[PDB]
């Protein structure tokens, strides 16, 4: 199956009392695996199969790295806020990571946000930074003047990240590589609507849709979000509105982890 590894950073200038000015957590797929913030000042595991497979040396080394990254993140946000000429509290975010797809191909990505909007986006194939405005453009110029850092990032994204991912995938294989099939039902809810409802499934990736007469995909389908049920499985739904003057026959189609399912109504 397709898997991904990513690390986020969040920086806040002038945070309210108690709230950390810096947070960083990693994920494998939807599972948190590591966390760090400016209060604890420690990198800690957020999944049992991480703590169990990475020696204290790992947590110690990356804790020191993160303490450095925390400082630099503050200086960078400070610089952005100065250049935007912004007062008050603003956010800085980063996301780095990679995907290993089923067919064995890979992707890698690195990008930044200011106040929750794209700011800088890395292209590891053109070895360049996309800038969304002239504040970002100034940073792009400084960053692109340092060719080694770009090369380094391409290497980390394409080789190291994928190696880390395969490693964590092995650590958590009992969780990450299991399959729990969906339980699927259709519910009727002066207008009638058919709800196709799935629950109990893992992984959270699932494809649900409505077809009419088995030949055409229905336009105007309301899609529900894939939601955590809290027990490590997920639930989702999709609905369509019925036309009493139409002679259409409907069916729910669900695809999950290589199995297709049809519920004819």
């Amino acid at each position, epitope marked *: 199956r397709t898997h991904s590894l990513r690390y986020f950073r969040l920086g806040v200038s002038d945070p309210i009392h108690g709230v950390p000015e810096f947070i960083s957590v990693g994920y494998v797929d939807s599972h948190p695996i590591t966390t760090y913030d400016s209060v604890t000042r420690q990198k800690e595991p957020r999944a049992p199969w991480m703590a169990e497979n990475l020696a204290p040396d790992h947590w*110690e080394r990356y804790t020191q*790295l993160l*303490r*450095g990254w925390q400082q*630099m993140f503050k200086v960078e946000l400070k610089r952005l806020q100065r250049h935007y000429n912004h007062s008050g509290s603003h956010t800085y975010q980063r996301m780095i990571g990679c995907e290993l797809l089923e067919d064995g191909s890979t992707t890698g990505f690195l990008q930044y946000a200011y106040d929750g909007q794209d700011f800088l986006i890395f292209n590891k194939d053109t070895l360049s930074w996309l800038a969304v405005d002239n504040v970002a453009h100034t940073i792009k110029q400084a960053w692109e003047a340092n060719q*080694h850092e770009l*090369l*380094y990032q391409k*290497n980390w994204l394409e080789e190291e990240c994928i190696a*880390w991912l395969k490693r964590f995938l092995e650590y958590g294989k009992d969780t990450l590589q299991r399959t729990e099939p969906p339980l699927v039902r259709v519910n009727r809810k002066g207008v009638t609507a058919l709800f196709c409802k799935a629950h109990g499934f893992y992984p959270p990736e699932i494809y649900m849709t409505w077809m009419k007469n088995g030949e055409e995909i229905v336009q105007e389908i309301d899609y529900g979000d894939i939601l955590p049920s809290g027990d490590g499985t997920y639930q989702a739904w999709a609905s369509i509105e019925l036309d009493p003057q139409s002679s259409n026959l409907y069916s729910c189609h669900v695809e999950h982890s290589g199995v297709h399912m049809v519920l004819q109504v």
Partner: antibody
Amino acid sequence: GQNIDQPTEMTATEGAIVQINCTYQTSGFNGLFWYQQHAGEAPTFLSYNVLDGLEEKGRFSSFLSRSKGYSYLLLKELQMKDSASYLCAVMDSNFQLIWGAGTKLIIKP
Amino acid sequence: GITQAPTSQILAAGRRMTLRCTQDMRHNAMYWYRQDLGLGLRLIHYSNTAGTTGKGEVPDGYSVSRANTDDFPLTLASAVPSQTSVYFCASSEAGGNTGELFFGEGSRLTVLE
């Protein structure tokens, strides 16, 4: 990582070319550095490689092959002032810089 | 740039020595290495930014502090013969990226019983 290997000493002639090798076994790779260190003095930065191929800087070039786990530092048109130790260092998966034992380059006038 | 002091020193085993290191380049990362014949540079202690420090490969017998960006003193609480070595302080704008190290002049220490 675990091992960075480079020859203890090399001797070449003034005006010629020398290739100083550095092989590495590490857990993870985030780039390879070359430093020059004259006897009794501080190391100074020469080069950094992290993708494959050859990168030139004046009389010195630095090559890397990740798949083979090695790099060389190439010195052309040797001069007496190139007499020095040349140190190899690799950043591993934890970004720990791991240093080879250095190669002492002797030049015959 | 970066300055190390003192640069040459004889020491009775048991004495407390502090090697000074300062840079005004505003580098966040600073390092203490010892260099010994036949070995690659070995890291003693390091600091990625002010207010934190970490242990290197051979921390034992040594301690550091980093209350500020500029200074990174290496203290030997009670020197021993095996601590005869050449000590290099080095700094880098940031830890763990492609930016190179800038080395101090080196400090030659001989600890004698």
